[PDB]
Structures are given as C-alpha cells and as structure tokens.
Amino acid sequence: ARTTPIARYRNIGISAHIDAGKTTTTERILFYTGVATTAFWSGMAKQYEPHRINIIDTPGHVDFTIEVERSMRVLDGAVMVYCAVGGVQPQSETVWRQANKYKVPRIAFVNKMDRMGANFLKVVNQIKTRLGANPVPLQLAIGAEEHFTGVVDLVKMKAINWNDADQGVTFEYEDIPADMVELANEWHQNLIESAAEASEELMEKYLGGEELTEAEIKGALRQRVLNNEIILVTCGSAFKNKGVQAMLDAVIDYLPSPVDVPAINGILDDGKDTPAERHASDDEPFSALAFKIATDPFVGNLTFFRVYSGVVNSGDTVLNSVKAARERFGRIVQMHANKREEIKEVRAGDIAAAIGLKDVTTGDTLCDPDAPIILERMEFPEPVISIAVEPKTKADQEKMGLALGRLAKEDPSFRVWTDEESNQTIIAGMGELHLDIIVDRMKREFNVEANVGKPQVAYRETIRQKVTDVEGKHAKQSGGRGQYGHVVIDMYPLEPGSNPKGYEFINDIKGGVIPGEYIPAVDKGIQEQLKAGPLAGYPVVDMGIRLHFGSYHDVDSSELAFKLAASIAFKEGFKKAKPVLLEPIMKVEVETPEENTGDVIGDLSRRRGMLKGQESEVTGVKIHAEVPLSEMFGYATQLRSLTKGRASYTMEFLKYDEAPSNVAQAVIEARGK
Amino acid sequence: VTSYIGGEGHNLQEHSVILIRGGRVKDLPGVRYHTVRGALDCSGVKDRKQARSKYGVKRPKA
Amino acid sequence: AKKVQAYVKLQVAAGMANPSPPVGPALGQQGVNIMEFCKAFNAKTDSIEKGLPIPVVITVYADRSFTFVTKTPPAAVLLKKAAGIKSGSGKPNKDKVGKISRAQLQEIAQTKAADMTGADIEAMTRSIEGTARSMGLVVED
Numbered sequence A: 001a002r003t004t005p006i007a008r009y010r011n012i013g014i015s016a017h018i019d020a021g022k023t024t025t026t027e028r029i030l031f032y033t034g035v036a037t038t039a040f041w042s043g044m045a046k047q048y049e050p051h052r053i054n055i056i057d058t059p060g061h062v063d064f065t066i067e068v069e070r071s072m073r074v075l076d077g078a079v080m081v082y083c084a085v086g087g088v089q090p091q092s093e094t095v096w097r098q099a100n101k102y103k104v105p106r107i108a109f110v111n112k113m114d115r116m117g118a119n120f121l122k123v124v125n126q127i128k129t130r131l132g133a134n135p136v137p138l139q140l141a142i143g144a145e146e147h148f149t150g151v152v153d154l155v156k157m158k159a160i161n162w163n164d165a166d167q168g169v170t171f172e173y174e175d176i177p178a179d180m181v182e183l184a185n186e187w188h189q190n191l192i193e194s195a196a197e198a199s200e201e202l203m204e205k206y207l208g209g210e211e212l213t214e215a216e217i218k219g220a221l222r223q224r225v226l227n228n229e230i231i232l233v234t235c236g237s238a239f240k241n242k243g244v245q246a247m248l249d250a251v252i253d254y255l256p257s258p259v260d261v262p263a264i265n266g267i268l269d270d271g272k273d274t275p276a277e278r279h280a281s282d283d284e285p286f287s288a289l290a291f292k293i294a295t296d297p298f299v300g301n302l303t304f305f306r307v308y309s310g311v312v313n314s315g316d317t318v319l320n321s322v323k324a325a326r327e328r329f330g331r332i333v334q335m336h337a338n339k340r341e342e343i344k345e346v347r348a349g350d351i352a353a354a355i356g357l358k359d360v361t362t363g364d365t366l367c368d369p370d371a372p373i374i375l376e377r378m379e380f381p382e383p384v385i386s387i388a389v390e391p392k393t394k395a396d397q398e399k400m401g402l403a404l405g406r407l408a409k410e411d412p413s414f415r416v417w418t419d420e421e422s423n424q425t426i427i428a429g430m431g432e433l434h435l436d437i438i439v440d441r442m443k444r445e446f447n448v449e450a451n452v453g454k455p456q457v458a459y460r461e462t463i464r465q466k467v468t469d470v471e472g473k474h475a476k477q478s479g480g481r482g483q484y485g486h487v488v489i490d491m492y493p494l495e496p497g498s499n500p501k502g503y504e505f506i507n508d509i510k511g512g513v514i515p516g517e518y519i520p521a522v523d524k525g526i527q528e529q530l531k532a533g534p535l536a537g538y539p540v541v542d543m544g545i546r547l548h549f550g551s552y553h554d555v556d557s558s559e560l561a562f563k564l565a566a567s568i569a570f571k572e573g574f575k576k577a578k579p580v581l582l583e584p585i586m587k588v589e590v591e592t593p594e595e596n597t598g599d600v601i602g603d604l605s606r607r608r609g610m611l612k613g614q615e616s617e618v619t620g621v622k623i624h625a626e627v628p629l630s631e632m633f634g635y636a637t638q639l640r641s642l643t644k645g646r647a648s649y650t651m652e653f654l655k656y657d658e659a660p661s662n663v664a665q666a667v668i669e670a671r672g673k
Numbered sequence B: 001v002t003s004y005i006g007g008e009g010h011n012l013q014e015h016s017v018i019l020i021r022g023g024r025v026k027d028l029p030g031v032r033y034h035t036v037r038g039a040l041d042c043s044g045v046k047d048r049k050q051a052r053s054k055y056g057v058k059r060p061k062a
Numbered sequence C: 001a002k003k004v005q006a007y008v009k010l011q012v013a014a015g016m017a018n019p020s021p022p023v024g025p026a027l028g029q030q031g032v033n034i035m036e037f038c039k040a041f042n043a044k045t046d047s048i049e050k051g052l053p054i055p056v057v058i059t060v061y062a063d064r065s066f067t068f069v070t071k072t073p074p075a076a077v078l079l080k081k082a083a084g085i086k087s088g089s090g091k092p093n094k095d096k097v098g099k100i101s102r103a104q105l106q107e108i109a110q111t112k113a114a115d116m117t118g119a120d121i122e123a124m125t126r127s128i129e130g131t132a133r134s135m136g137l138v139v140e141d
C-alpha cells in the first residue's frame, strides 16, 4: 500500500553561528506546519501533498560542534542560517567545512532582515568570497531593517507579502515593487543561467532564447543542490513573520529525500573488512545508526537512532555489531506532528528514540542479527581543555563517578580519568563553556557538590650536585640480637631523560666488604626512598648512585638492616646534594588568523610560553611555544576571546625541565607548610 | 566490609559497581568476601584458557 | 617591483625550502603563498653557491603574482666564503679574527656591485669594510 513515499521525507538540520535565530525559525516552522522533531508540511499555498520533515536543531556554539558533526553525518540536507547584519562568521566557516566533509546538500537562509545594517546581497557575496561557495539567490529582500516588508520570488517573478495580522499564516502574490523590477530581472537571469548549467539540453534551450518552464527551472536547481555545486539562498525575518514559509517550500523543492542520498557505506562483520552498502528501502535488512544518547529522568537512557534500511518494531532484539551485543529494542515513539505516536514500525528514513538500551553508545550500528554490518565510525576529536574536579563529601565522591560516567556516555568528546599521581579526578572537554555545562548538569540533574580546580602539576625532585663518601650505618645491636648494616655511597645527577628508568645503580664494591647477597637489598632500600624525596616528598628522578664502600657483621648483618643503612645514607646525601623541585613543560601549537596572531602571543608571554617559532599557514600562522602545564589552563576560552572564535590549539607533554628558582622555591615552602 | 579481589590484575577505578561473593582468604585477617571477576565491572580476565567459569572468561575464539 | 607594503627582503636559502618557518623569516601581517616562490628560484638557484645567503624580496603585485628581486651574494657571507671564517660577530677589537687584503674584496666587488647599489664597483668596497668588522674582521693590505 503506497501510504507516504520515503521520497516525501526531508531529514534536515538547522545550523548557524551562535546567535543567528534558528530554533525561533524552527518554532515558526512548527507553528505554520501545525505542530529532534517531526513535522508535516504541505506548502505555504497547500500546493504539495503532505511531506514529512524530520528536523534536527544543531547547537550554535563551537564547544558543542561535536553534536553538529554527529547530526550532519546522520542527516540528508541542511538549512544554513546566516545573520543579515553579521554575515558569514568564523563559526559559520567551521560548520560549513563539517557539512562539506559529509557532502550534505544544503540551502541558505539570510535571517535578521528586520535589524539595523541588514544587507542580503552582502551576505550572498560573503558566502561566495569566505566559504568558496556558489550562492544562487532564489529570493530578493523587499526593503531592509524597519522597512523590510516581504521578498521577491525570482522563479515566479512575484512579490510575496505576508499578512502581519495572522503572524504570516496567509500571504498574497503581488507585482514586484517598481524600484526593484530591474534588480529582480538581473537576478532572475542569473538564476535561469544557473539552472541552464544543470544539463546540455537546458543550456541549448537557454542559448536558443527558449524560456525555461518553472518545472524545468526547479528540477535543474534541485539537481545541482543535490550535487553540492550551488547553494540556493533564501531570505526573510520572523516576529513580523517572513521567509520561513517560503524557505520551507524551498526545503521541499530543493533538499534531498533519503532516496536521493547515496547508499550508506558499511563493513561486513566477516573479519576481512568487506565493503557493503545499505539502500534506503523498507525491503532491505535492518540497519540503523545510534547518533545521540540523552539521559531522561523518567524513562532512563534515550538512544536516538536513524534507520537507513529495513524495518524494526518496538521490542526487537537486534545486534549492536560495533559492540557485538544483542540489544532488544525498548519503547520507541515518534513526534507525529504534536503528539508522540509510539511507533511499532520504524521504517527506512525515520528518526526515533529507543528507551532502555544498555550497551549502546553514540556512533554504534544497530542491525539485523542475520545480516551484520558496521556502518562507518564517528571519529571524535581529542579534548582540548582539562580541569580537576574534587567532591566536597564522601557521598559526593561515589555520586561524582556515577554522574561523570553518564555525561561521558552521552557526550564522547567528554573524558574522565583519575590522575595516578595527584589522585584527582580530571575532566576534559571540547572547550570550557562545554565543561561549564557538564559541571552545571553534574551539580543540578545529579546535584553532586564539587569544587573545580586545576590539574595538579606533576612535581618531581632531583639533585644539582655530586656528593661522595655518604655514610649510612644502621647499627641497632639491641632487643635480642643486633641488626648491623653499613654502606657508603656516592650520589650524582644524571642528564634529564638520559635514562628511561630515571635512576642508575653502580655496584663498585671491592674486597667483599659487603656480601653480594645484601647488594640487592641496598638498591631496593634506595629505590623505596626514590618514591618519596626528602625535600617535599615527591618522586626523585634523574639520579645515579654508586655503592663503593661498606661493612658487615657475620651474625648481626641483615638484608633489611642494609636497606635501612641505604635509606639513612640516601637521606643525608640528598640533603647535601642541593636538592631541587622539577617541572613539566608542554609543547603548544596554536592555529590563528594572521590578524589575530599578535594577541595569541601577548597572552602566551605572560603565561611564561617560550615561543620556539611559527609556521604561517593558510588560515594564518601556526605558532609554537614551550608553556608550563600550570599556565596552560583556561586557555580554550582565553584564546576564543582574543581570536573572536577562529583559533584552535593543541598541547603535548614535552620534557621534565627545571622549574624557575622562584616557582620551585615557592612550592617547596608551601608543601613544607 | 572489606572484600577481596581475585585474578592477578584488575580493571579498577575506585568507583565501580562490583559484585561480592563469599569466601575467606585465610591470609588477610579482616577480609572475608571474594569478588566475582566475571560480573558487572570485572570482565574476562587476561590470558586464560582453563577453568574459564571462575574468573568469568568466555571460551576462546576457536 | 611595487610599493613598500609588500616588501620583505628575505630568503637565506632555497634548499631549506619553505620560507615560512624560522629558516625563512617574516610571512606575518602580509599574506602570500610559500611554495609559489622557489620554483622561479629553481631556475635561478644553480648559479649561486651555497653558504652565501642572497637577499631577495617577496614583492607581491596587485594581481597576486610574486617573484623575487635579485641582488647578488653580499659583503657579510663572502667574508665567510673568500676568507674562510664565519660570523662570530661582536669582537673587532678584542682578539684577532682575520685580516683581508685590499684586492681580495675588489675581485668580488664586481659581483657585489650587482648586490650593492650606490654607484660603482670601487665605491662599494668600504661597505664590505662595514659588516666585516661587525662580524669581527680587520682589514689592511
């Protein structure tokens, strides 16, 4: 029974730079349609059969662009929202590159045409010049700012005027304003020329002076959008309510259905990585991608999944091929217009959520157990900022682990580990505003009382002076039998990192002054003292010890007596050897626009960052600097402030250098206190 | 109570829902309960093909 | 050539490749390609001997094309070439680095009068006398 063709499905993302107006445009959509959300659209003139629009509203911030990446990958088409005043933003370029990576056929909506400085054609030219795109206006704005009244449809060559009294639910077709007729004819010719380029037949008609029909123009522009050759540009502004309705008609006319998109690539679970495809059909084996996990207070884990092939029912044991885990599907609803119609028939093209999946993560493939496939995996970027989180109480201690676990499950770009040296819980994320939201959820949804600090710098200990002839004599001949042990050691610094063990032991015992059986106990006594340095109780590194002189007693000498002597000798020698506190240094790489370059280093200089050099790149300059871990905290948001949000840094542990005398001494004193 | 960790190397991170079973080790006074290395936070332990039921390892590949 | 707004005289070498990292300086608050440079220098490299950094300019025209401004291996690195002792700068007056004859520069001043442009071959000799003592040299026949 032919019900609603999958060719009527529009799986679309609304994507924009932070602060551009995209969910208000979506709220306008829901109002006009009748209502991840499903909506139904029949056209602003009711000229279309009912189309199913599944909308994913993607975050504007770059701290949550990981969600945008997941969405873009799982979606068919996109609506790119631009501010008429601000135009193409640095963050728009990031989202634009992500949509290019996934080859998402997309259109453009120039919103905020009611604000001061609104300029449609300026934004069209910025899409061309900054994004390297081919923008083709479908519409022209009638007026600007407070004088924005409507739009010209360049396909129909008519003005669209929306009724302000019904919030734009009704519209009239008018003749083009007399001051715009010349400009409308110019852009109509540019639109027809852009349509004619879609095929040799349409190019011949156009060059022959034959007028293209509205159906040929629409079909030709659709083909090129699907090919990602052009971007169709629409305009309009809500509040007075304009554009959205005609942008929704452009979604039907020009954006892909699930059958217009290439088959999804995957790998067979045969151990040979055999390539396979899944076509957008109900008659194919079931395959779906889990793309979002949300924690719900009432139903537990919601796993959002997009079906690409086949059909599944609410309550169907499928196979999580990625995690090799048979997962019985839970309760599955669907946002049928306003209601949440529980669907027991998730067909190809549909987006739904399952309740109570246990071993499913974002990026997992859910498939038919009799036809295993792994759909292509999501690569998750490495976290760029880390902070220490400490529980206030012991109740908060266990609760913290639980809360952070849930947050790491729903958001892979969020990492949590315990630092083995500090025993602090370290959390890491895709920016500090990202970490701020994570902390807020932890101390609200889960209400876990925690302090936010900085990852403790891994302080080390070493000497800066050879000391010779250091006597250690454990002579405890008391309490029954005596315990005699006597060693003489030299202590000397090693070059930093010259020994992968951080420690050298030289046995230079001559004359059997110490029996060879006790020499391992002396070394073990030193190695235990290396774990807790005599200066501040940090591990001692980059040190050599030569045992060359010693003495035993035939009855009273013990293995651990010589280990006690070794510790005495070590503690006395270490204090004479001018002990110092060490530091880690981090190799930092910053990618920035050439005009923002200066600011980056100004701050890095205050952060004790020894700028090694620079590699002027295409974006601008790739500056390299040696910056202490202590000064590499809170840099994500600071960089975002200096560079207006167009810079990305990386950092790696470089080497164990010497902390500046001031820094080292200050910490030594604080630790002693 | 104080529990005991089986196997020879765990997968622990100090906040981990682990399961408890009876049994006194006779060697640590005050440790009276074993853990299960096959249940809920301790997976099939490393490098073992015999008595797989204890320490929870599944049967090997072939 | 063009205005001094697309002016950086640079290029210590050609085989070290990229003139963007430390080796090649500048490339800051200016904006231009980097591999688009040494290809015209690749038809130009094999006349210059290495160890002799030649000053050329990234002169960018108004239509995105840029080539270089050839001015011959100069005073400083030829006294690290024709004498045989490198930079060592700072000590003209402390200890003896090297004395250079009168005619040892005049034979390469004809090459250096295509590098230096005040007027003449003889007239540029007393500025080969310049940076030599800043490198630390002394000069007498």
Ligand SMILES: CC(=O)O[C@H]1C[C@@]2(C)[C@@H](C[C@@H](O)[C@H]3[C@@]4(C)CC[C@@H](O)[C@@H](C)[C@@H]4CC[C@@]32C)/C1=C(\CCC=C(C)C)C(=O)O
Pocket: A023, A057, A058, A059, A060, A061, A064, A067, A293, A294, A295, A410, A411, A433, A437, A441
């Ligand atoms: C508009 C849109 O769709 O994104 C919204 C939706 C948003 C990504 C929200 C930020 C953040 O709570 C998000 C997390 C990770 C919060 C923790 C969990 O509950 C996740 C299951 C949840 C997913 C969606 C959600 C609720 C958004 C914002 C608005 C917050 C503004 C900022 C940056 C301070 C966003 O980042 O833009």
Ligand SMILES: Nc1nc2c(ncn2[C@@H]2O[C@H](COP(=O)(O)OP(=O)(O)O)[C@@H](O)[C@H]2O)c(=O)[nH]1
Pocket: A016, A017, A018, A019, A020, A021, A022, A023, A024, A025, A060, A111, A112, A113, A114, A236, A237, A238, A239, A240
């Ligand atoms: N006047 C006017 N205001 C708008 C328009 N679109 C959005 N806004 C306002 O701008 C704000 C941002 O909208 P939102 O959709 O949250 O932006 P997003 O962050 O891009 O999703 C909202 O509070 C809206 O009231 C518009 O077309 N006209």
